[PDB]
């Protein structure tokens, strides 16, 4: 399953960010919510103007977020991962997500 890096993300730290992104020539809308007690980011994925999000999950490092969901016509077939740029023991935080902040959220697409 050859895959190539094709997109990177950044977060400003606002607890209720929402924006639209284009992946594999298809367009999706994303929502990020910050959880206080669990100090983690909650990601919701869905179609543009959809009544409810298609997928909701909790973000973690080195875990394949989309693994159990590559069976729907509206879910990207690529790979979405979070891995750190600094010390390997650093876990995902609020302000430490970005191309140079410490954690590299990235999307990669299979070659077809």
């Amino acid at each position: 399953r050859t895959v190539v890096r094709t997109f990177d993300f950044e977060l400003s730290g606002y607890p209720d960010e929402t924006f639209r992104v284009v992946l594999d020539s298809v367009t999706y809308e994303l929502r990020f919510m910050w959880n206080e007690r669990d100090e983690s980011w909650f990601m919701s994925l869905g179609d543009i103007g959809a009544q409810r999000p298609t997928i909701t999950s909790k973000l973690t490092c080195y875990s394949d977020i989309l693994a159990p969901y590559r069976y729907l016509d509206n879910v990207p077939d690529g790979n979405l991962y979070l891995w750190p740029l600094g010390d390997i023991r650093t876990r995902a935080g609020r302000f430490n997500i970005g191309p140079l902040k410490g954690i590299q959220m990235t999307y990669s697409s299979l070659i077809e």
Partner: protein, 305 residues
């Protein structure tokens, strides 16, 4: 003690999606978050014309100094048709004045003030994409053809006047946009077809419906009525006779509870009588400008349907 001051509200909802049942813009008001983006206290300029013809009713709007979040929400959905409703009145109530889809949107922000622009269409999407393919044989009742084509258009039936026991004289075939075919049936049967604020209206030319509205100095009239020809050209005449051919003009303070196909009574000191409505134009400047409506009336000579 207060003054008599204007008020309005503007709402933006989810993208409109056409399905297999009549479309109601009402149910799309709520956004995924729930409550919609309401804009009340910002200077707004708008112009909304309405008519009884094939073309949809279109209205223009301008808003100054919008927050970045709202503009961002419209930068997205630029591929989609957001539902919008507009309300206006006088400090105690607001009547629905337009409802449709955002056909166009653009932003210019030179130095001091941003100015958003809109172009809205009343059922533009349905009237310009509803295809049909129907046929009938000699002897078919015309009343059946009319109902069959309207159901294809997928819009609520505001009001219809059936043909009775009329029957087709020759075989007929219909294709292309349903609206165009219906507008052709209008010419050959003396009927008026026009969609407005989502409602389908099918009536007969020359005839009119009670005094649903009365115009007088108490009713906020603005200036005396003046006679104006209802068309920019004159037709040759034998001098169907029942058709229109005359009209008048009046202006009044903004009042959204009026429609092109309604009937009005004109209680002035010079002119008195009953008239049909043929055209509407709503104008508005919140901080500065008029807040009035203009009606183009047409004389009637048919039966009182």
């Amino acid at each position: 003690m207060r003054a008599m001051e204007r008020t309005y509200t503007l709402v933006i909802g989810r993208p409109v999606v056409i399905g297999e049942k009549p479309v109601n813009i009402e149910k799309f008001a709520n956004t995924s978050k729930g409550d919609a983006y309401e804009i009340k206290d910002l200077h707004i300029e708008f112009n909304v014309k309405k008519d009884n013809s094939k073309e949809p009713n279109k209205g223009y709007v301008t808003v100054y100094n919008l927050s970045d979040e709202v503009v961002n929400y419209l930068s997205v959905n630029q591929r989609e048709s957001l539902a919008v409703m507009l309300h206006a009145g006088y400090n105690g109530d607001e009547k629905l004045i337009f409802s449709g889809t955002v056909e166009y949107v653009e932003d210019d922000f030179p130095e001091e003030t941003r100015t958003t622009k809109f172009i809205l269409g009343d059922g533009t999407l349905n009237l310009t994409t509803a295809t049909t393919a129907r046929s009938y044989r000699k002897g078919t009742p015309v009343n059946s053809v009319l109902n069959d084509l309207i159901a294809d258009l997928k819009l609520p039936k505001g009001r219809v006047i059936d043909f009775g026991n009329q029957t087709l004289q020759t075989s007929m075939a219909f294709t292309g946009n349903a609206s165009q075919n219906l507008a052709n049936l209008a010419k050959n049967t003396g009927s008026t077809f026009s969609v407005q604020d989502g409602a389908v209206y099918w009536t007969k030319e020359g005839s009119r419906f009670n005094v649903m509205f009365e115009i007088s100095e108490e009713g906020g009239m603005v200036g005396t009525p003046t006679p104006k020809q209802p068309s920019s050209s004159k037709k040759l005449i034998k001098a169907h006779d029942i058709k229109e051919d005359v009209g008048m003009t009046v202006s009044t303070l903004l009042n959204g509870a009026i429609l092109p196909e309604s009937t009005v009574y004109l209680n002035t000191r010079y002119h008195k009588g009953f008239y049909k409505v043929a055209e509407l134009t709503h104008r508005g400047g919140y901080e500065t400008g008029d807040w009035i409506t203009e009606l183009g009336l047409v004389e009637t000579r048919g039966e009182l349907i």
